[PDB]
Write a protein that binds this ligand. Sequence first.
Ligand SMILES: Cc1cccc(OCCCNC(=O)N2CCN(C(=O)c3ccc(Br)o3)CC2)c1
Length: 121
Amino acid sequence: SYDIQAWKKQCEELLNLIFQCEDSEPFRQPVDLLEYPDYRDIIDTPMDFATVRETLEAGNYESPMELCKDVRLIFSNSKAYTPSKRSRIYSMSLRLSAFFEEHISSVLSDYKSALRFHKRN
Ligand SMILES: Cc1cccc(OCCCNC(=O)N2CCN(C(=O)c3ccc(Br)o3)CC2)c1
């Protein structure tokens, strides 16, 4: 399965599944400072799933590793901000992260395999 470009539609498909998840709803759009006025004291680099989808659709990811770094930033920001490990929203982030990681592993493996096959000779 040595298609170097296949990761892109596989990531579009996985972002579609994440948007159906009720657990994604807090992570879809950038955090509102009005409601969370200390957010940007704690979080240097905001990230959300709409920004990830738009970066993908613009052709501004070169690999699924770059997409994976930005999605992992959504989850590390939720960890950096939770006032408690037992917060509702952090708890939603942990389930959504498990789902993401379960599905992205084959996307990454197949991409890396395809690049190695391209460089085989
Ligand atoms: C106009 C409109 C329409 C529809 C949705 C929309 O966006 C929803 C609000 C965006 N989420 C949000 O506010 N947060 C998500 C990220 N945070 C945490 O991860 C976190 C950890 C513990 C706690 Br508590 O929060 C901080 C809160 C905006």
